Amino acid sequence: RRRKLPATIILRALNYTTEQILDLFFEKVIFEIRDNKLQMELVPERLRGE
């Protein structure tokens, strides 16, 4: 109960990079763009709520 610190500070302290942090919590949205067309690995679940 000492003082606030951004909750990612410890994550870094545990030998996790920013990439690792974004990997553990957040999922991914991969893009298979065929150069053009902005081809996206869309899934119907991602659409829900939009």
The residues binding another protein (CB under 8 A) are 1-10, 12-13, 15, 18, 21-22
Nearest to another protein of 10, 42 (CB atom)? 10
CB 49, min distance to another protein, A: 20
Cβ atoms within 10 Å of 11's Cβ, excluding its own: 16
What amino acid occupies position 22? L
Are residues 24 and 13 in contact, defined by beta-carbon separation less than 8 angstroms?
A: no
Q: Which is nearer to another protein, 19 or 45 (CB)?
A: 19
C-alpha 45/C-alpha 28 separation (Å) is: 13
Minimum CB distance to another protein, residue 32 (Å): 26
